[PDB]
Symmetry: D2
Subunit: 284 residues, 4 copies
């Protein structure tokens, strides 16, 4: 997987037949290599219609999700593997090449205590199976680190690497998010350096989830590190500029993050491409 991506959330998080059409077609209009398709309601995902759309617009896909609470792997590793395998099935049916995101827990997950090795054993058992399942489908399996307020288990790139190395699969990659690294990494570039080998996917997101280029992410440190490690993965824009008011609680976002989705699509995607160009990402 290599190139520029846009998260389907730039148009919607639904994936009914015309939500899929609007996001895929729009991602083709912005000349992206990949679209990131959220898997929220797995039953209501039409993989044949989606695959038809992807092939019509010449667009590759990766899938992402956050584990719902019944399926959090730190406490319920068996419902985790169930949910993760049923989402991998839908991702493979659809033509997507990977499942990534918060595949090990929730974005509202909290015990009140530090992570315990029992929790990590649960994560390791659950994730080694669903990754093994991903292998049979030819898929790669992503682990995205999020900030301390969303999850207590995988916050830094170092925790993500250590978890990957414990599972010991060969198709798991580390997925990092500049919105989360802006808090969790002691110098954002250290997260990219720490993940080095396993880093194949980036959420390129401004510090306020608005427009990359107009916030506090140190983008020159980010692209410097990405270039110097020889990154050949996907750079996917993630912004909450299109998120509906209905979604506020699920993303702890209580006010507008930007002026509107189309300005974020214009200025944000151009910014990532221009900055990729300045640092010769993919220039080898």
């Amino acid at each position: 997987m290599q190139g520029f991506g846009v998260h389907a959330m730039m148009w919607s998080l639904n994936w009914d037949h015309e939500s899929a059409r609007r996001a895929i077609a729009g991602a083709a209009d912005y000349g992206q290599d990949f679209i990131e398709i959220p898997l929220v309601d797995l039953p209501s995902v039409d993989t044949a219609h989606t695959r038809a759309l992807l092939e019509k617009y010449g667009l590759r896909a990766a899938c992402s999700l956050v584990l719902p609470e019944p399926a959090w792997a730190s406490v319920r590793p068996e419902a985790a593997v169930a949910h993760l395998n049923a989402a991998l099935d839908k991702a493979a049916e659809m033509g997507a090449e990977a499942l990534t995101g918060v595949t090990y827990g929730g974005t509202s997950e909290r015990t009140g205590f530090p992570p315990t090795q029992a929790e990590y054993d649960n994560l390791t058992r659950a994730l080694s199976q669903s990754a093994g399942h991903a292998k049979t489908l030819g898929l790669q399996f992503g682990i995205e680190a999020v900030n301390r307020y969303e999850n207590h288990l995988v916050n830094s790139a170092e925790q993500a690497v250590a978890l990957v190395e414990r599972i010991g699969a060969d198709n798991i990659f580390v997925h990092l998010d500049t919105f989360h690294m802006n808090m969790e990494e002691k110098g954002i570039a250290n997260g990219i350096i720490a993940a080095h080998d396993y880093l194949k996917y980036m959420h390129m997101s401004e510090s306020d989830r608005g427009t990359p280029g107009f916030g506090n992410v140190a983008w020159d440190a980010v692209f410097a590190a990405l270039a110097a490690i020889g990154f050949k993965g996907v750079l996917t824009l993630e912004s909450f500029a299109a998120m509906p008011e209905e979604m506020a609680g699920a993303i702890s976002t209580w006010r507008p993050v930007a002026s509107g989705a189309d300005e974020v699509l214009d200025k944000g995607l151009a910014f990532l491409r221009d900055k990729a160009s300045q640092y010769r990402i993919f220039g080898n």
Copy 2:
């Protein structure tokens, strides 16, 4: 209220006799003008002892707090006023010059929805009462903006200014935190600029709660904005480097933020001092 401050959490969040002594003495060893004293359990605090130690060590103080959930002002405004007024009595008894922090709500406060006008009405009425009570004590009253994961009501400087202006009280000030602004402000310095009439207190906190100067906060933008708006208040280091493991759930902190408090104190307080001098803060 002007100068360099350090939050007492660099030594402990506890405030019994021995922790009070250790925190105040520590602040004095690092030449600070202010110590920020947290008010967690008001009955367990010996204000006259604290007052005597502040004078012995020649230290000024600000108190700070987070409202416990029975007293969140957005839903329980009358309980908020009772808790804040008792907190202000203890602050005044200590000889503190202000009560600041999350004086309007919690740091685990969330409705699941955007803040409503009713919630802001409750906040407005409650804080007018307690700032009024603060005024009778000779104390200023601060509103600290915190990030979207801790509270849904006051996240950006603009929300803080707007609430301050709704209250209309002459002794309220905006209190900004670089850790929170690093997420909430569209360009951190825009927060300082938005708040320029009311900004009198800063938490200078690195983006990972570690050591200022060694993370993701754009300190030159912070210090330029502070200098250009003419800032005259207190610059208070806040770091989690001394926090005990038992605090983890309270501060949503799951792993060490730095090596130890002694290094954060040494390097972080010097970094703040050297940047202030570079940008001629305070002249």
Copy 3:
């Protein structure tokens, strides 16, 4: 003088009749409020032609120059006054609102020694007289600070301010350039802050003279300081992307700075507008 400007060097440094139309039309084409028109040798400039085009395309103008060595005010103040006064006449004729740039010396000027008081006296005498002439013509007079390798006299905003204060005119303003400030200012925002009473003109120039947004200028600190001090002048793009190889020695530019002027105009002018909006420079 307020708004968004672009230097005519994005199309050519020659101001013959058709260079002027393609420069004025280009700046009009990119929505700019101002064009900055260079005055290299004054007899070459057809002022009647230019005022017509400025009227036609709805475009205001400022003129800029660098003193030629026979007229360096450091050493030859009366030659400087004659040169400045003649350029002021041409600027007034074509309807420019100001003459700015290195109006006090050269961009390859040095003595091998730090600037002396006698040198500043010569500078004061010349700029005093020529700023008076400019005042009679309704024109403001600008002094642009440049880095230590171009000139030994006016490098920091502080030096520019102190000179403007010496002269005591009311129509002299400080002109700063982010390319030179990136070297000269101890924290780029400190230059803007130092000039807050006099800053009416910016060259917004990337650290390598390329494209704003793609270099080492800390634009967040630049724009925050501009907003915080309430800047109301002109933000003018300076880039060398259109300079021909034959200008190399005059601008110490030995290799490409970008991939053509059109890209710099597209991305650089948009960047300055987008950042000015982020920090509410003009509303």
Copy 4:
């Protein structure tokens, strides 16, 4: 060659017996692994005395110079080789492990035109010879890129790499300077990235030649790049804080760069060490 260095200009560029003592003792007092010793007046240096002071305080050294104008390699390549080998002999006698700096030209060198192929042919010839002489001495040979106003020949990391590769020697490294990179590199970390194969030496220098961490150099981008490419050479602080006012012309510095050398050494070396630890450089 690895560790933290300080340029002897922090105490003086005169290398008489007492100034060498003050400098080398100073760099020891600040716990440095290296001191960078400038070579300007060759007959005035006691190599035996310096080697002694180095070995006494357990300090490693690299030498640096700028070519005097009669020996600018671009136009006078035979004079350049003569001068470089002379400095190299002195460097090896001192116990230094490399000769670096503007070893190919001047800091006021200017033709009025962009660099020519003929000039680069001259550079390649003189540098390949003098690097050959360095190898027989057990020394490495450094090439420092400087900004467009001091030199028209080696300004970007990319030009330094191209030159190094055309010489084809084993013991030539690229040497960068954040003060010059802050003007020349399109994103300062791009210079470190482009020079990755050959970068063995840094001048860690603030944008105004003052105190590192208190100017415009994007230090997190610098250190990120250095960490990400696996840099394992020398980080040497360069600052004009100790320079006398009679040096102004040689360095085009017309006003103080900081309040004093002592605070630059105290704050700058501390800042570089703290950032090096933050990014796990060594």
